[PDB]
From Swiss-Prot, chains A, B, C, D:
Keyword Signal: yes
Organism phylogeny: Bacteria, Pseudomonadati, Pseudomonadota, Gammaproteobacteria, Pseudomonadales
PANTHER family linked: AURACYANIN-B (PTHR38439), OUTER MEMBRANE PROTEIN H.8 (PTHR38439:SF2)
Purpose: Transfers electrons from cytochrome c551 to cytochrome oxidase.
Plastocyanin-like domain sequence ranges: 1-128
Binding site for Cu cation: 46, 112, 117, 121
Pfam families in alphabetical order: Copper-bind (PF00127)
Keyword set, alphabetical order: Copper, Disulfide bond, Electron transport, Metal-binding, Periplasm, Signal, Transport
Any one GO MF annotation of this record: electron transfer activity
Gene coding for it: azu
Location of the protein in the cell: Periplasm
Disulphide connectivity of cysteines: 3-26
GO CC entries: periplasmic space; plasma membrane
InterPro entries: Azurin (IPR014068), BlueCu_1 (IPR000923), BlueCu_1_BS (IPR028871), Cu-binding_ET (IPR050845), Cupredoxin (IPR008972)
Protein name: Azurin
Length: 128, 128, 128, 128
């Protein structure tokens, strides 16, 4: 609602939303991530990473190779527009980015880079 | 929250929650279902059906055999404790049920009976 | 084997293979898709579509927006290297494509673009 | 060939077969599982568990909760007909079960109980 959304990854390896629309009138957008289940981050840790639909596979491939030590994301990956940290059960993290970094007409995807999760834990983001 | 929950079934064949807790102080519990997407019910229609974990397969099987006109649910199926109608994009439907029909110590599952959807559209309901 | 493969999509939204190897000596390669199930194409239609692993998500998103009469594929989608049409119960279709449209090394994916199906219906194709 | 099948589960949560046919003439049947991948047991561990289709959801829920050291299976779960251990990268494990445990006219499902996996890692087993 407004320029923010609350997203949560769960023990079923699913996100509560698979589509986000950021209104043109937002200077910034905030994503508050929560993990309501009871599984440790090493078994079911989730994060929210945003890139272009085109960069999704690269980020996911380089990400799952970095280990949970690096939250399953290549450090200083340029394709990642914004991301949360990798959290487990009971944790929460928020990320805020400037809407100036998104152009109308392009397709973005948000996803979880923890091994295998991106199969279900993905979704669309669009600036309208 | 209180004795109602709002559930969304979306166009990527996912519910927004896969676990529901019904407080024992609720005499009645209310599920409000909405379809936030743009696809029609003949293609991506969703409902919320409740049964025990044990009956889920029997209900899903007899259900997809009944067709769209029967909301993909078998009429007078005694395994269903409560259910919505099958809704499409933009539609909404609520169903209140009596919490005295659930008991402590039983595993219940909620699911969508539209063909194939219960693989991802399923979740737990337990009384507490 | 050699320059043809046969594949079946079923009512549980599963292809009977996860990987297709294309012998680099094949001039053209045929894929023969069949739907042995009972569900109609509007409820469980399956097609076989081929793109690079990087372009698949774009193809899946523009696909579901194009509707059933367009086989849930964007018309003249540059990223689609080859594709069958959407078939329902009983039906079969093939596509024969030129093998020089694939370069080796690169990763390719085959998947179904009918709504919600690609999360379960996908696999890899390698030129070997 | 013989009363045996050899099955793989890859790092992308996919078993290499959706269906297993057990010829009625076998006294016992053996499944030989291999995880031909690079990811370890705690991240992408897989197992082959067998139950009737009606019991699968119960097995998965109670399995999830049991933890890795219990191979994500409730100890002495009467609904589990047969199962392998939970394995990871380059491991193999076999299970042999009496075909007398199965009666025809009942539907069986094989699946992985590692968290999240069950929805994608599944298939049917039938007696012929
Ligand atoms: Cu995750
Ligand atoms: Cu549904
Ligand atoms: Cu399909
Ligand atoms: Cu597994």
């Amino acid at each position: 609602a407004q320029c923010s959304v609350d997203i949560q990854g769960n023990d079923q390896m699913q996100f509560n939303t698979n589509a986000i629309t950021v209104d043109k009138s937002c200077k910034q957008f905030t994503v508050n991530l929560s993990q309501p289940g009871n599984l440790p981050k090493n078994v079911m840790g989730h994060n929210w990473v945003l890139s272009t639909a085109a960069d999704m596979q690269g980020v996911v491939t380089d990400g799952m190779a970095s280990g949970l030590d690096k939250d399953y994301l290549k450090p200083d990956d340029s394709r990642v527009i914004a991301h949360t940290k990798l959290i487990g059960s009971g944790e929460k993290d928020s990320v805020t980015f400037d809407v100036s970094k998104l152009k109308e007409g392009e397709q973005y995807m948000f996803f979880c880079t923890f091994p295998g999760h991106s199969a279900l834990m993905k979704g669309t983001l669009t600036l309208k």
